[PDB]
Design a protein around this ligand. Structure first.
Ligand SMILES: [Cu+2]
Length: 235
């Protein structure tokens, strides 16, 4: 149970974005139904009044929280991967539009899941803004909690993989468009009951064997991190 509070651009806090530049859902409950319209941008997908200005090559940092800013972030039980997708905003996230910029699942070197490192990072994970066409975009940040993912939601709706999905409105101003954005995958639709990484038993299956759900990270993606960029306590 986690939500995005706001974003940072090059380590500068853009301030509370809830219902302002984030398409915030009403609460931190997960999405679990893979065929739900709620898979796109969570349960309250609508245009919000602001879009955060960035340039290509900026560091864009998402900041998550549980109940209050810079708290426990997400229950430690919620081991799983983190992904970020991008789509042109005029799509409203509909159709074959979502392109993956970032994936971090289980780090063998560190013996930690992305969610474990997100807590350590005070809820902060980042991407490099890609060199796509200038214009308005949705950045879809997706945490998958796998602590109840041994079941399919479609078999037992009390369990299943848990999707924490947050869509930020981002406007890319300066971009040379060296990597034009291709078509991508649909949400809902890209994840199904047979997709690798959706049904996974963290109690019995080693995390070293986990394969995160496709699609693969786009060739145009410039990277990211799970690391504290900004100290919310200094504000
Ligand atoms: Cu939860």
């Amino acid at each position: 149970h986690t939500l995005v509070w706001g974003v940072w651009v090059n380590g500068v806090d853009q301030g509370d974005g809830r219902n302002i530049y984030i398409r915030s859902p009403p609460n931190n409950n997960p999405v679990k139904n893979l065929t739900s319209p709620d898979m796109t941008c969570n349960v309250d997908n609508r245009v919000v009044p602001k879009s955060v200005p960035v340039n290509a090559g900026d560091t864009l940092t998402f900041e998550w929280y549980h109940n209050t800013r810079d708290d426990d972030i997400i229950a430690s039980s919620h081991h799983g991967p983190i992904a970020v997708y991008i789509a042109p905003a005029a799509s409203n996230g509909q159709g074959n539009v979502w392109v993956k910029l970032f994936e971090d699942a289980y780090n063998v070197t560190n013996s930690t899941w992305a969610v474990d490192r997100l807590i350590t990072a005070h809820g902060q994970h980042s991407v490099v803004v890609p060199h796509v066409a200038p214009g308005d975009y949705l950045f879809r940040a997706e945490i998958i909690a796998l602590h109840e993912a041994d079941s399919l939601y479609s078999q037992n709706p009390i369990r299943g993989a848990q999707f924490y999905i947050s869509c930020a409105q981002i406007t890319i101003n300066s971009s040379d468009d060296s990597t034009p954005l291709p078509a991508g995958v649909p949400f809902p639709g890209a994840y199904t009951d047979s997709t690798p990484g959706i049904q996974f038993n963290i109690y019995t299956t080693p995390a070293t064997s986990y394969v995160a759900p496709p699609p693969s990270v786009w060739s145009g993606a410039l990277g990211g991190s799970i690391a504290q960029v900004g100290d919310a306590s200094l504000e």
